Every structure is written in C-alpha cells, then in structure tokens.
Amino acid sequence: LTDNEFYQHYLQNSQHMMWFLNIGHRVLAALLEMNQTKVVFTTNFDDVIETAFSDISGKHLSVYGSYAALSALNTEAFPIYAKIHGREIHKCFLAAAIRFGLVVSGYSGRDENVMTMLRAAIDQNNAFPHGLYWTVPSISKSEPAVQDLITYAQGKGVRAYLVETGTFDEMLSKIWRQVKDKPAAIDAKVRTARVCPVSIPLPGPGKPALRTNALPVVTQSIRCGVVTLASPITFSELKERISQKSPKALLTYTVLFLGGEPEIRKIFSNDEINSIGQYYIDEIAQSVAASTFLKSFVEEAILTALLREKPILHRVRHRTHYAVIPNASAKDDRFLDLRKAVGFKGDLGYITGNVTNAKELSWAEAVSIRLEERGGKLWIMLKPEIWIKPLDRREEATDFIRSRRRYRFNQCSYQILDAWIKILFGSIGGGGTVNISCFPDAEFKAEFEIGTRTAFSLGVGY
C-alpha cells in the first residue's frame, strides 16, 4: 500500500486511528488537541509530546497507576497518552485495539514484549477494524519480524499493511497539511515549520510520449590510476604539459589519470613521480556532481571511449566535444541512414560538403555530446548540429546554418537523432546496453555501459 493510498485512507477516518511511536511532535500535538487520533502509545520518554501539547493548548497532558490507562480509555476521557516502558497498559492496548485502527511509526520491533503484546491484540474477533499500518522510512530496511507480523495478521484476516513513507515527522507534516477545519491558533503554533530541502516525489512511469536525447549511463563505478608527485602541481601546468606532449591517455588533477603507464612515464619524469596506484570512485554520479574536475575527466573519458573504434572524427568547441563527420569517411554505408534523414522529400541528403556562398568553409553534420548529472543519474546528451571546418569562421556560414535546419521539424529531427544514435552505437534503441571501452590495451582502462535507447516517458492516463 503506497503512502498516497495510506493518506487517503488515514485522512478519511483520523478520529478513530491510534498512534504508536520538530514538525512531527508539533503536528501530533495539534492533531491530539484537535480531538483526532485520541489514543497514542509510545516506548520512549520524548517528554516533548506533552510539552508540545501544553504549548498548543495551555493545559497539562494525561501521561501514563494500577489501571489508570484502562480507567481513562473505558470512561472515554480522551485524549490519552501512555508509555509502554518495555501488563498495566497491555489490557488497555487490547481494549484500544478493537476501538480504532492503529498506525505504528518509528518502531522496528526487535522487542519481544511488545511483539507478543501486539500479537495477542490481533487474535480477537474485531481487532484493529480500520487497519494496522506500519510506516517505516524504507520498506527493505525494516527488520524481518515486522514483515512476519504483517503477513501473520494478513493471514488472520486483519487488514494490516506495511506502507513505505518518509521520516515520521515528514509523514506527519504531509498528513497535517491535508487535515481540514483546524483552529487558527493551532495553525499559527505549528505552521509545519519551513521546508528548506524541497523534495517532491517523481510520479510513476505511467502510460503521446516524448523522446528526449538523453542516454542513460548505468556504469555506477569505474577504476582509474593515481600518480604521486614529490612537488606541488597546478592544473594549468598539467594541461600545457599534455598539450605540448599529447600522450595517449586522459589526465586531470584531484593527480588522476586513465591510460597506459608508458604515457605517464613520458609526460612525467621518474624524479617527480613517486608511485602509481589505483583509485576506485565508488559513486560516479556523486563524484562528478561534487567535483567539476571529475566531471570533465569522466565526460572526456566517455567521449574517448565512444569514438575509439569509429571512423567519425572528434572535435572541441568552447570546451564542448563534438562527433564531427570526416570528409574522407563520409561515404560509409553506416552514414546511409543519416543520408536518408538529412534527405529532402525522401531522397539522399548531403552530410558533408561546401557551403554555397563561401570560398573555403566546408560544412559537415555533427552532434554535441555532453555529460549531464541529473539527480543521481548520468545522461549522455546528444544535440544535432552543423559543424564548420574553420572554428573561428563559423559565423560566416550562419545564413547557411539557418538555411539547412529551417525545416528539420519533429519527424526530420527524430530521424536525425535515431540515425546518429545508430551511427554512434551501432544498434537501435531496443534492448540496447552496449559497452564501450577507452584504451582497452592499457593497465588503467575504463569500460562504460551506456543504454542505447534515449530517455523517454509516457503521459500518465487512465
């Protein structure tokens, strides 16, 4: 039972729902004062519940004698607060059990006394008539005894459920934001505090879908190399060293590398090098999100792995990488699909040629490939584009750029993107998780498995 169903069901009958256990204490204090959820049980001190109630209302709270809980419950003199401290409340809990459905939060079980307490409360003919709801922050993290008890109750015929919600205070805030007819003083007192770290749930996948350009990256971790230096280095010095040497490996400072050891010995002499070790970045998404150096390193690694064995050329423009089609290899059969996509009115379409009104500028089709760290996911971002051979003369073809793409509408752009995905990965987006690897013949290589199908979602409907 999803939390939305629990909220619709809990909100409808909050008058007779028991609770077993700072917005959460505050919302509960307001919820009690409001005469809803009359009886609340707890294990711990948390003497803050009664203090919050006194702040809300201005009167003391009954906190639990021989059978004081029994006397208060039987006489219907709500609201009642009783701490288990784990048979004095055991009879009262069983008496409470028939009267209204119970919801237990902040408890993982693990205590046999309360376990037998609840199991004994279940047996009677009408026990927890509204339902027993277990709300843990995560379903899979809960102790096995809780699931065993839920299954036992469901077998007995009771309507016990195990629902996954957030933290108890967040759950109570979400409950209270939809409780109706609350006095002004209570709302002024609680106001659900303030929500700084906004986190609104993503809906279900659901089922006119839209196809995005994002390719998922499921490689959760990669292995790479570290070099130790006897002297401090700056990133600019490393960058100019790579520019002047041009090794067959990818370098960054965080000093981190990926490629062959002899290239490292070429770029760095023995005197400055102390030792070479390995780095295991366990969480790639979090790492590239926290550090921009890792972001650039990983995007360049994926780029190198992507055009390693393919005839397409790799260029760079304002620090964004492009998969530009070379003129020499523009006649390959693999580009034929692209030849169809660029084509006008179902004919062959030129993908590399001479701009009609410039002396030496030569144009080609290309795709900008970027890395996007969204949430905790890595996406390969494909954007079709027209590349111009002189990097600094691109604007001279601006009109031509406007002329060619003027009619690359949704169908044409869809064809272009599908053809470019086929060119870059060799397979269509059906059951595709192809693997690429950069520098396969090196000690420190990186293999990345990229989902071939572009990210997409279907509109939710009935």
Partner DNA sequence: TAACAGCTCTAACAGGAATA
Partner RNA sequence: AUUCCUGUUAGAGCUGUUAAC
Residue 346, interface with another protein (CB under 8 A)? no
Give the side-chain half-sphere CA count within 13 A for 251. Answer: 26
Taking the least distance from each CB to another protein, the nearer of 45 and 407 is 407
203 binds, among another protein, RNA, DNA, none (CB under 5 to 8 A by kind): another protein
d(CA 264, CA 75): 83
Please give the size of the binding site for RNA, defined by CB under 7 A. 17
Residue 362 or 403: which CB sits closer to another protein?
403
Count Cβ atoms below 10 Å from residue 14 Cβ, excluding itself.
18
Q: Has 399 been labeled as part of a binding site? A: no
Residue 180 binding another protein, by CB under 8 A: no
CA 255 to chain centre: 30
Binding site for DNA (CB under 7 A): 234-236, 239, 292-293, 295-296, 299, 319, 344-345, 370-373, 398-399, 402, 406-407, 409-410, 412
Sign of the dihedral through C-alpha 433, 439, 441, 445: negative
Residue 275 has a CB neighbour count (10 Å cut-off) of 7
Answer yes or no whether residue 182 interacts with another protein by CB under 8 A.
no
Applying CB under 8 A, which of residues 167, 413, 427, 437 lies at the interface with another protein? 413
Residue 108 counted as an annotated binding residue: yes
Q: Is there binding between residue 292 and RNA (CB under 7 A)?
A: yes
How far apart are alpha carbons 118 and 97 in whole angstroms? 9
Residue whose CB is less far from DNA, 138 or 236: 236
Task: Find out whether the peptide bond into 183 is cis, omega within 30 degrees of 0.
Answer: no
Phi-psi region of 424 (alpha: psi -120 to 50; beta: other; left: phi over 0): alpha
In the complex with another protein, which residue's Cβ is closer, 17 or 251? Answer: 17
Question: Which neighbouring-strand residues pair with 381?
Answer: 214, 370
Buried b (16+ CB within 10 A) or exposed e, 139-149: eeebeeebeeb
189 binds RNA (CB under 7 A): no
CA separation for the pair 180, 202 (Å, rounded): 26
Residue 199 annotated as binding site: no
Bin 115: left if φ > 0, else alpha if -120 < ψ < 50, else beta: alpha
Tokens 């169809």 sit at which residue? 340
430 binds, among DNA, RNA, another protein, none (CB under 5 to 8 A by kind): none
Show the tokens assigned to 414: 């869809």
The candidate with the shortest Cα–Cα distance to 311, out of 352, 250, 372, 353, is 352
Residue 414 in contact with RNA, rule: CB under 7 A: no
Closest approach of Cβ 326 to DNA, in Å?
23
User: Which residues, 6+ apart, have CB-to-CB distance to 453 below 8 Å?
Assistant: 215, 429, 430, 432
CB of 296 to another protein, least distance (A): 15
| Cβ-based nearer residue to RNA, 95 or 289 | 289
**Hey, which residues does 276 pair with through a beta bridge?**
227
Q: Which of 140, 231 has the CB closer to DNA?
A: 231
Q: Which of residues 252-271 bind RNA (CB under 7 A)?
A: 253-254
Residue 45 annotated as binding? yes
**DSSP-derived pairing of the beta strands 256-258 and 222-229:** antiparallel
Q: Rank residues 287 and 454 by Cβ distance to RNA and give the closer one.
A: 287
Q: Is 308 annotated as a binding residue?
A: no
Q: Considering CB distances under 5 to 8 angstroms, the limit depending on partner class, which of DNA, another protein, RNA, none binds residue 200?
A: another protein
Q: What is the pattern of x (binds another protein, CB under 8 A) and - over residues 356-375? A: --------------x-x-xx
Q: Is 283 annotated as a binding residue?
A: no
| The two three-digit tokens of residue 76, written as one number | 């219907």
| DSSP summary character for residue 63 | B
| Distance in angstroms (rounded) separating the CA atoms of residues 21 and 48 | 13
Specify binding-site residues for NAD(+).
43, 45-46, 108, 110-111, 143, 168
Residues within the interface to RNA (CB under 7 A): 232-235, 253-254, 290-293, 391-392, 394-395, 398, 401-402
Residues within the interface to another protein (CB under 8 A): 5, 8-9, 12-13, 177, 187-188, 191-192, 194-196, 198-214, 216, 218, 370, 372, 374-375, 381, 383, 405-415, 417, 429, 451, 453-462
Specify binding-site residues for AMP.
110, 167-168
